[PDB]
């Protein structure tokens, strides 16, 4: 994708990256006044500005400026300043846009004669580069091709200066034989580092005091900026020269670039009737060629798309810009709003419906208002409830919206909009039945629907063989043949998946746009391998013509990049071309045709499989060779291959404006080469090299012999009517159709439009993970951090489900704070050292130690939490209480330490009481617990309530007497057995630290001396 | 259960198994059901065989088997494991 950059920025980068003997002078002379500047402070920054003679020119990328005489040459401080007077900021016309001139620029001038200016360009051909250069420099340029020499650089190949001087220096004064030859060698290299694809310096004036690049033009390969960001910094690529951008514009230029989809909108007349917003970019240049077909030149409002699956908020607002620009003002003939579109690959039709129907129903006041006829037309994955949701909106608003199918054709729909009609070496074989693709990359559903639609054309062996991802192991990925479960096996090296299977021929390049060329560069080094198929997008054109010439070189079949791949039907299929399955039935793509096609654009490929299903026979093969600029394979490489193919009788082409390539076809035809039928039509008119545009080919086509149509809209008519031709003659036969085999749908896709209920088991009251937030029990994560609670409150939220207030989240976080390490000598502990000291893990050294919080360690908790509930639940004294736990057995749990008790506490018992003393309102629990204290300590000065104890009566205090628990939640919590859970997560960090320090202390296996242990076995078992 | 039944639907699969075939008429093993398993009279090491490498090995290799299953049985309880063991059923 050549973007032409502005010569500033170009000529900064010259200024800046070029290396070369010949010394560039007015080195960073330049400057930009702009109306958003003011003009001292470039006087204050660049001290030289005014102490030479200046010229002052628009870099606004306007060409010829020199011949129409608008640059300002030989100015003084007077001159710039009121030469951009009547200049800087005012609107004005070149050619025909019109618009603001509000960029210019500011070179030092140097006087020089016409004798010294000479003319070098670089421009990029599919070939190779071209270097052009012609000593008579400036606008006197005379003969332009026939006395300027050429040189034909090929890739990957190095200049060399002697076959400079030989060839392109004829013409050249001889002193600056090497002051030119090396610094365009230079510029070579300067060409050749910073991936540019047009580069011309016109004029370019070799004086005796050196080299001046007065005037230049730069067009860089946009696509590859990852290879050389650090060279151009932050490039800038300025916009055409034409008038202002409305706000909606803008706006949906920031609904563009703010997700992976293609949201395109430029209008042309914003008070026009006809609208359109068509999914595709092929799809919406054939709408717009057709509505300039039927007069409406001056009634396309707009041009634009929307592809790549927007999201429904995406397409809401876009729906909703695109429905507010038609109801400004009124056009008396009605105001149409055509939703057209090709057939969808996978995206269901029905999702960007329910977005389309948001969009209208939330406008629908001013549809009805301006009298605004709708026409949908869509195909793809169950279109058929989306035409039912767009024809209810339709009965339900009052709008009337016509819909329709795929039954009709795609854009007749305008002519029913407009009233025109009522409304109702290389090898010439690359896919056989036995050929086996390696697929590189984890791409599982286009692997998924190449085995769908073998089974489905009828074929005995899958043909994925294996597929290639770097990033993994070897294995093997599950798939689905018909019914039934296979292996396909996933490599990590392309080198073992060649070796272990020798069947396969073609390889498909899911890689992306930075590792496309290493794989098929790598891919190449295998012989076996006779065609590769790029579905990448976005290689820079360089790389690109390296893969072309290794390619023609080692003799395999380049399908091209921005491919969609290209199906030959009842044979084999290149990755998503096509589609889902759905339009691969709905298209009759199972059986071989009579009919070839070769078009240029993914988004035609599968309107041109429903033209010539509903038309003729059906397609024999179809290839889509990319919407790059160099494809791998052209049009003439691929008609010249269904010239020696048998099978197929008739072609049909489908070629784009630019690129003289259909006039190779032309000579072909008329040279007595393809004699096969040929149908060619090539898109993109937009009327609204002179040789490149649609209607030269068209004529060009017309008048060679291959059957043209008048517009996109009988282009149905006439292939039937050359498929009339042809089986009239004799020649074509339509074979018998049998039925294919079925494959069972899915139940991601039936689930999807729902029709198939499944039970769900694993209820989950807790932590919704999918959405925009981790939502918690009910509250999002950002209201968890911004409403500042602490681990108290998540576990309130995460254990109980209920926002806890504020005393008791501290709580909580008390008693995790006093039950996490209580000495490395307690049980549980013990066994997280043993474990940790046999140089274990974190997670077995914990659970090791963890798997101990029971019934005798840990389980005082519980316990004495259900104890103490159970004795006043009940309701009696205390008193009575003590008496009946003596009776029984059963010493009362929580009750009892081994040193410190009474004028000697706890010390942590006490800071737990004190809180629950202070913030903690109604606490009747922990009161009865302390009764009892008071009788078992006069009982014996040990027998202090525990941590353990108080922990659970103040537990079962807070959960029962704050707010939002009921009694039979509070009730239910106790016997779950969340206190066993605040003990668990409370020593889990005591225990986590008794792994970190025994493995920082370097402890080694335990053994446990024979001293210790007292074997006291039988005597003979 | 019924669009499955009649089998108009496809559901990938996980958890691949290649081993203990737990429904129909027996339990069949690696692919030796469990009356040809007591009726070759193979004893634990034949099923190790069939459980852990899907492999009938030979009658001197189950022997074997159950030899140094026999051998790694318990080591005293001083050892560490052992020891962890004992802590935690002490712990009851
Ligand atoms: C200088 C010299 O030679 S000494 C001069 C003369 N010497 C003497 O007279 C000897 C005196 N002997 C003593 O002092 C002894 O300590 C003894 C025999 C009185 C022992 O008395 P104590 O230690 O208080 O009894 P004990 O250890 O069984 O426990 C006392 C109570 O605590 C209770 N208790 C213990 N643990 C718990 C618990 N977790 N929860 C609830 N109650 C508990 C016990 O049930 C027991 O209850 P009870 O009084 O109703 O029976
Ligand atoms: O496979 C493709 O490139 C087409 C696709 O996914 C889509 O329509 O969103
Ligand atoms: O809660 C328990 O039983 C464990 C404990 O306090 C201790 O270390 O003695």
Redesign the interface.
């Known amino acids: 994708s050549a973007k032409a950059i502005s010569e500033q920025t170009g000529k900064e980068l010259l200024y800046k990256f070029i290396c070369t003997t010949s010394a560039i002078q007015n080195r960073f002379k330049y400057a930009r006044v702009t109306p958003d500047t003011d003009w001292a402070r470039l006087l204050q920054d660049h001290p030289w500005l005014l102490s030479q003679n200046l010229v002052v020119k628009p870099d606004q990328l306007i060409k010829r400026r020199g011949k129409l005489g608008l640059v300002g040459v030989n100015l003084t401080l007077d001159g710039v300043k009121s030469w951009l007077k009547p200049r800087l900021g005012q609107e004005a016309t070149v050619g025909k846009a019109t618009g603001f001139l509000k960029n210019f620029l500011i070179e030092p001038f140097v006087p020089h004669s016409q004798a010294e200016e000479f003319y070098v360009c670089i421009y990029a051909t599919r070939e190779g580069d071209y270097v052009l250069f012609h000593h008579e420099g400036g606008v006197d340029v005379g003969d332009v091709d026939a006395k300027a020499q050429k040189l034909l650089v090929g890739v990957d190949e190095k200049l060399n200066p002697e076959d400079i001087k030989k060839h392109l220096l004829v013409h050249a004064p001889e002193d600056k034989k090497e002051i030119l030859a090396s610094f365009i060698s230079g510029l070579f290299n300067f060409y050749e580092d910073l991936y540019f694809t047009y580069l011309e310096i016109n004029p370019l004036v070799v004086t005796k005091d050196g080299v001046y690049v007065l005037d230049l033009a730069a067009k860089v390969d946009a696509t590859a900026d990852y290879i050389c960001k650090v060279k151009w910094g932050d490039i800038e690529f300025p916009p055409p020269f034409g008038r202002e951008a409305y706000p909606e514009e803008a706006y949906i230029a920031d609904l563009d670039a703010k997700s992976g989809a293609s949201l395109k909108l430029t209008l042309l007349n914003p008070k026009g009737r006809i609208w359109t917003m068509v999914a595709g970019g092929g799809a919406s240049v054939v709408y717009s060629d057709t509505i300039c077909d039927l007069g409406g030149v001056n009634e396309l409002a707009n041009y634009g798309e929307y592809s790549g699956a927007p999201s429904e908020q995406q397409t809401y607002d876009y729906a909703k810009t695109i429905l507010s620009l038609m109801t400004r003002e009124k056009h008396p003939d009605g105001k149409i709003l055509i939703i057209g579109g090709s057939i969808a690959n996978f995206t269901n039709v029905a999702a960007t419906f329910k977005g389309i129907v948001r969009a209208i129903r939330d406008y629908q006041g001013p549809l009805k208002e301006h009298e605004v006829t709708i026409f949908v037309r869509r195909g793809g994955p169950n279109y058929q409830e989306g035409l039912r949701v767009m024809g209810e909106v339709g009965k339900t608003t009052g709008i009337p919206i016509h819909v329709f199918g795929t039954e009709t054709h795609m854009t007749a729909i305008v002519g029913m909009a407009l009233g025109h009609r009522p409304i109702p070496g290389k090898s010439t074989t690359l896919f056989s039945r036995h050929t086996k693709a390696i697929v590189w990359g984890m791409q599982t559903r286009a692997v998924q629907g190449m085995l769908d639609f073998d089974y489905v054309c009828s074929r005995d062996e899958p043909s994925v063989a294996a597929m290639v991802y770097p990033f993994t192991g070897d294995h093997k990925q599950?798939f689905?043949w018909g019914?039934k479960?296979i292996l396909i096996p996933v490599f990590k090296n392309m080198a073992d998946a060649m070796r272990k299977h020798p069947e396969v021929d073609v390889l498909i390049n899911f890689a992306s746009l930075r590792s496309a060329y290493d794989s098929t560069m790598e891919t190449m080094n295998y012989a076996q391998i006779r065609t590769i198929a790029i579905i990448a997008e976005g290689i820079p054109e360089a790389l690109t013509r390296k893969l072309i010439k290794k390619a023609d070189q080692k003799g395999v079949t380049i399908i091209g990049p921005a491919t969609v791949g290209g199906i030959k039907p009842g044979c084999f299929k290149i990755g998503n071309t096509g589609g889902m399955l759905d339009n691969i039935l709905a298209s009759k793509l199972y059986r071989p045709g009579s009919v070839a096609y070769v078009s240029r654009s993914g988004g035609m490929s599968n309107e041109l499989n429903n033209i010539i299903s509903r038309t003729t026979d059906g397609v024999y093969e179809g290839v889509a060779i990319g919407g790059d600029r160099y494809p791998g394979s052209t049009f003439m490489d691929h008609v010249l291959r269904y010239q020696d193919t048998p099978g197929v009788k008739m072609i049909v082409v489908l070629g784009e404006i630019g690129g003289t390539e259909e006039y190779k076809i032309c000579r072909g035809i008329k040279e007595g080469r393809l004699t096969k039928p040929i149908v060619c039509w090539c898109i993109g008119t937009c009327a609204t090299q002179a040789s490149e545009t649609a209607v030269a080919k068209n004529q060009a086509l017309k008048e060679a012999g291959v059957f043209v149509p008048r517009s996109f809209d009988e282009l149905g008519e006439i292939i039937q009517s050359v498929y009339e031709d042809l089986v009239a003659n004799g020649v074509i036969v339509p074979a018998q159709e049998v039925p294919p085999p079925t494959?069972?749908?899915?139940?991601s896709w039936?689930r999807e439009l729902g029709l198939?209920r499944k039970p769900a088991s694993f209820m989950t009251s807790i932590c919704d993970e999918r959405g925009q937030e981790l939502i918690y029990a009910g509250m999002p994560i950002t209201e968890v951090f911004k409403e500042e609670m602490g681990i108290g409150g998540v576990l309130g939220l995460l254990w109980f489900q209920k926002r806890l207030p504020k005393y008791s989240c501290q709580f909580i976080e008390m008693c995790l704070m006093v039950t996490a390490d209580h000495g490395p000598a307690v049980?549980?502990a013990?066994?997280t050292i043993?474990?940790a000291?046999?140089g274990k893990d974190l997670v077995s050294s914990l659970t090791?130690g963890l798997?101990?919080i029971?019934?005798?360690?840990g389980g005082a908790l519980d316990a004495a939490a259900k104890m103490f509930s159970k004795a006043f639940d009940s309701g009696i004294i205390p008193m009575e209480f003590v008496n009946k736990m003596k009776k029984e057995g059963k010493l009362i749990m929580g009750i009892g330490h081994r040193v410190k008790s009474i004028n000697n506490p706890d010390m942590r018992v006490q800071i737990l009481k004190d809180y629950v003393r202070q913030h903690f309102p109604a606490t009747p629990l922990l009161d009865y617990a302390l009764e009892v204290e008071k009788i078992t300590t006069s009982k014996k000065p040990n027998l202090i309530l525990n941590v353990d104890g108080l922990i659970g009566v103040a537990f079962v205090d807070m959960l029962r007497n704050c707010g939002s628990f009921t009694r039979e939640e509070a009730d239910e919590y106790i016997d779950i057995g969340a206190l066993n859970g605040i003990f668990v997560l409370g020593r889990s960090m005591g225990f986590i630290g008794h792994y970190l320090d025994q493995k920082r202390l370097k402890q080694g296996?335990?053994?446990?001396?024979?001293d210790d242990?007292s074997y006291v076995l039988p005597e003979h078992m």
């Open positions: 599950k689905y019914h479960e494959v069972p749908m899915d139940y039936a198939i049980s549980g013990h066994n043993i474990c000291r046999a090791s798997l101990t029971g019934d005798r360690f296996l335990y053994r446990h001396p024979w242990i």
